[PDB]
Amino acid sequence: KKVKIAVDRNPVETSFEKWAKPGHFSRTLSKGPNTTTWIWNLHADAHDFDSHTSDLEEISRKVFSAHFGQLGIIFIWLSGMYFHGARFSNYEAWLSDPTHIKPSAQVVWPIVGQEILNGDVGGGFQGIQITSGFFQLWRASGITSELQLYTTAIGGLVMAAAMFFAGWFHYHKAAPKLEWFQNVESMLNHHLGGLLGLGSLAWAGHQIHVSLPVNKLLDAGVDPKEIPLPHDLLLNRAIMADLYPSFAKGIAPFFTLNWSEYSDFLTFKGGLNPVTGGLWLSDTAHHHVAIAVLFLVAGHMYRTNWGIGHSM
Amino acid sequence: DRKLWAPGVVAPEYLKGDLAGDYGWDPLGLGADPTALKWYRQSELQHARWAMLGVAGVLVQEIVKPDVYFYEAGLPQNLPEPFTNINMGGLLAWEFILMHWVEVRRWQDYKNFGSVNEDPIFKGNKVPNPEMGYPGGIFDPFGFSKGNLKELQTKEIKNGRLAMIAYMAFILQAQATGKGPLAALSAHLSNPFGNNILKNIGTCTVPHSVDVQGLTIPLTCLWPGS
Amino acid sequence: VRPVWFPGNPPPAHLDGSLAGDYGFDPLFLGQEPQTLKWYVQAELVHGRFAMLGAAGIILTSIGAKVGLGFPEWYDAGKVVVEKNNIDFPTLMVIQFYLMGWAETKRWYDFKNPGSQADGSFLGFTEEFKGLENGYPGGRFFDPMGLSRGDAAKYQEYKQKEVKNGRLAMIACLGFAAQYAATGKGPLDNLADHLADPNHVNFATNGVSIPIA
Amino acid sequence: MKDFTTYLSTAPVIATIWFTFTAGLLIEINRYFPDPLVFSF
Amino acid sequence: QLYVGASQSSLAYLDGSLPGDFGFDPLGLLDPVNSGGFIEPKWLQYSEVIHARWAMLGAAGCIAPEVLGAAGLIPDATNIKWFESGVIPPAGSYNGYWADPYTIFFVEIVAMQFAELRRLQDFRYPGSMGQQYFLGLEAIFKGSGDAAYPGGPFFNLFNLGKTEAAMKELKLKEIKNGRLAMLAMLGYGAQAVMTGKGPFQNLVEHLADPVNNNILTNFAG
Amino acid sequence: FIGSSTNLIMVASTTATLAAARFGLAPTVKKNTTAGLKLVDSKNSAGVISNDPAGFTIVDVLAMGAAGHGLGVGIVLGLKGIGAL
């Protein structure tokens, strides 16, 4: 198998001994300062991994676990916005009147008079009127409760510590070899198929089974505490057949190639949804389905371990 | 030692046939400590000999009278003619102190095998104690020891081990159906398909508490279900 | 060779078996310095020393309650005794800092200088405050039975019996607060509820302990 | 963990601890003393 | 090699020892060169054995309340399906146990920290578990060099598989009824997500209508 | 549905792609296509112990099964879209 898992067991001791010695990565910096240009060259040459060593394997292991550090910080950053979306927001009040209540998810502390930044954003709430549009993601995700935002914030802290573990594991404990990284045929087959392809298959499945029946009930007009919870939209097919009457046919029109019978909730409407101003969600559902079938097909392009497939 | 509990089983190294009833058993390693094997031997003899009194109590108390039920034979309303509605606090006061003497003398025969043989009041006749757990002397009024002692020492355990399982049977054939052992023998031998192990496991005939003179008792069956 | 907190895993290098209650439990390597570990051995004792006083104090005032006596519960004993006896509350706490902040800095300069506090600097008492080892002063006042001398083989056993009761006293005084914040009643009311029905009257059936009720 | 306490005693870590000390001290004072424009008594 | 889908590349190391071996390795996960982490050749054979004999307890565990209920040996109140037991309280939960399924879950938590972590520290430290005092019961727990097959005087009670040649059969036959049973648990789960019935009911309904009641006529057309 | 208009298409498209690559009318694991169009031997990147005489592995079955579904689904929905069934 030319395409194979190849790591090295324990390349670097997990130790605080090198945190005691700043500038340890470079020859020019490890001898301590004599000049304030040392501490600027410390931060300048810090992530210049090509300049630390000459070994391309050691460079590659450094950029592979640093990417888990950037992803681990993004998972903290996302989980902040769901948490500040949960405990300090008006997302409960915003869904009932999303025309007058301004979206707000940052609340400041009343100390030096800076509580005047808590404006009258509506919905029985005071806070900084945000503009990053998370509340429009969350209605598109069909969140409808601050419990869902809190559970995916805890799911964000868990995922961030998993990403910090992964960069620690794939550098200090079990770090890959060089020819693992140089399988760019296997990387593109996995990233086009698994990341982009199965990702948009999975999100379409979130849009079929969760966001479409929730946002159909919001557009028809139902208070968000009266909508069925989305796990009830899975276990009960008879609820889904009330909104879109083709779930009663099950997944038989898919395998019988009677795909025109799915026309209720995979549409090609185009334009905008006039009730809410956004795109049609059944339009975006047929989008991410057809995106997924495209990338899973394109994810079987390059040759890895069997003679089929192209070689770059 | 031979003819073990299963055919193809190698006997453990600490079970070379010295003790009686040694069958190469212990698939839980408990006799691997030599100092623990003696105490587990003493506690096996205690669990054997109390069960042999327990079996010979239960299937005799219903031959002399199949009226008083042995599960509720401890309630003072069911005690016999000079003891009906006795104060159980007074009777427990006898039993505690009469047994904290006997057991601690036996316990010190474990801890110091040899410095507990004499009658401490009357410095007279000793008890010739050949091995631990087997006092003799005045505990042999019939002289049935001092023969092939190893033969009877195996007979004491094999009758004893069966009596342990039969007495836990005597309990579980009483909590499942509320019926005595020879009475559940009659219930089987009348209809041996509606009064089997089936359709009686999973029902506990014992209440949550039976009040004894102002005291409740938890009264738990050995499996859940009612 | 010795029993460790987690079987299989070896004890850390800084933690050979000489302390009382030593079971190799330092996963965070917090005692990796041999001089901060001299401080935490002092710290585990006086936390366990107060918790053994504490856990006996919660239990003995809760044994008296629910029998029929006029006792408060331990979370309400603070209010009821600065109200029954007309004790002004700041002048009670300040004297607590005077008497104990006296008794604490003596310890805090036992750790800095173990030979000290034994120069007759106090009222004449010299070798009473000498201090035998870390966390174990001894002498005439702190060991009036004289159990830390004579046989020292049984004293090492008493050292371990102090730490063992001292560990689970700290767990008890972490559990009395936890039984109160969850349920909202006294400790032996929670025990007697667990002895009424052991099923369904445990921690799992509050809705405060597991949120998946 | 002696090497870990050296890291806690570097220049930016003491800077970000002492600035949380000094801001956090002035924040608590400006909570319990609302708006001190002039030194009162 | 055997079991087509094999390859010449997954046949160098994968020789014919390491029982359950049939050469089927299209991806080449087990590979003693350049390995590390949990793709170690020792951890994967060990986890296959563990995944095998948990599944076959479940494979005889999901089917047993339904088979013994059709045979009338258990009452109809315990004739529930395996997903309707409290494992998935969305799918339905039996309310008549001796405790709340969160009481029984914590009893499961305690009993499976003491079972699984003793099970793990013999993988890491093979001579352990018969070293510290564990009620005298540590004399069982010496195990052997191999972690999947301890063979103490409890885990090899009847001393079955005496010789080496008789042992390779039973080690094979365990995996052979394991890889069947791991597929059976997949054929219990995915077959119950789609159908919504029990496994034995799906066995009865396929013996009744083989054609009109299978995977094909179950997509609810 | 068995033997309908679509079920005949999907059988006659999948088995056509299976009969293509087995009988030298499509590339396999054993043989690729050059920069032109000629069908030339491969490295196989692992070596296969296919017991079949043509070297036709299960990877060859999955590929031309995916292409047989890949052609056939485009034929079925292409014929529904034009109107011919």
Ligand code: CLA
């Ligand atoms: C189908 C399998 C698969 C999937 C899903 C991914 C996914 C990813 N790879 Mg990747 N990779 C793969 C196979 C795969 N890879 C193979 C086979 C190779 C070797 C040729 C590589 C080599 C490789 C390198 C060298 C790098 C990546 C990077 C990335 C990340 C892109 C960052 C991003 O856009 O955020 C997308 C983020 C998400 C989708 C969040 C979900 C994250 C999931 C849980 C982890 C990915 C799944 C994981 C691969 C499966 C193994 C699970 C693990 C427990 C063993 C993303 C997490 C880059 C990166 O960020 O480094 C960390 C990067 O530098 N990959």
Ligand code: CLA
């Ligand atoms: C950018 C993402 C990325 C990439 C490219 C890799 C790449 C690698 N990892 Mg790594 N890893 C990652 C993220 C990543 N990892 C994360 C986030 C973690 C933390 C959990 C780990 C933890 C980890 C460990 C502990 C080990 C590896 C190992 C490996 C190597 C082989 C992986 C393999 O064959 O498993 C194939 C993947 C599986 C068998 C699936 C595992 C089960 C996952 C969790 C479920 C599927 C997740 C899916 C992507 C998304 C959820 C689907 C669900 C909703 C149904 C390879 C070098 C192993 C190795 O060789 O050591 C270096 C190893 O021992 N990784």
Ligand code: CLA
């Ligand atoms: C031989 C039988 C057969 C028949 C009768 C049909 C008939 C049909 N197919 Mg079809 N198809 C077939 C086989 C068949 N197909 C096969 C074998 C496949 C698999 C490859 C497909 C895949 C396929 C897809 C994916 C789609 C159709 C569509 C259609 C319908 C309209 C086509 C049209 O107007 O596009 C005319 C469109 C254009 C002229 C513009 C195309 C430009 C695209 C959108 C963007 C630019 C791409 C790229 C940059 C261009 C240069 C790249 C080039 C080098 C490849 C029509 C009913 C379409 C459909 O169903 O619509 C309702 C559709 O989306 N077919």
Ligand SMILES: CC(/C=C/C=C(C)/C=C/[C@@]12O[C@]1(C)C[C@@H](O)CC2(C)C)=C\C=C\C=C(C)\C=C\C=C(C)\C=C\[C@@]12O[C@]1(C)C[C@@H](O)CC2(C)C
């Ligand atoms: C003592 C005893 C009972 C004594 C009963 C008495 C006095 C009863 C008296 C009464 O009834 C009457 C007369 C009349 C009633 O009105 C009043 C009472 C008072 C109710 C039973 C013990 C009974 C004891 C029993 C059944 C013990 C069984 C233990 C087993 C089988 C364990 C085996 C293993 O542990 C080992 C040995 C080794 C490991 O390697 C392997 C395994 C398997 C783990």
Ligand SMILES: CCCCCCCCCCCCO[C@H]1O[C@H](CO)[C@@H](O[C@H]2O[C@H](CO)[C@@H](O)[C@H](O)[C@H]2O)[C@H](O)[C@H]1O
């Ligand atoms: C990760 C693996 C990929 C596959 C995705 C699987 C995700 C797990 C989803 C499990 C949720 C349960 O899903 C499934 O439950 C029920 C059992 O068939 C179905 O419910 C249906 O079946 C029941 C019995 O047949 C009946 O009440 C109805 O027919 C209908 O309610 C749901 O239509 C389906 O949603």
Ligand SMILES: CCCCCCCCCCCCO[C@H]1O[C@H](CO)[C@@H](O[C@H]2O[C@H](CO)[C@@H](O)[C@H](O)[C@H]2O)[C@H](O)[C@H]1O
């Ligand atoms: C490893 C294998 C995983 C599964 C592989 C994918 C499954 C097989 C692909 C689908 C094959 C054809 O699929 C299809 O044929 C069956 C015909 O008998 C249909 O069965 C049904 O079709 C109609 C309902 O829609 C009814 O009018 C028919 O009476 C009924 O036979 C199924 O609705 C469908 O499954």
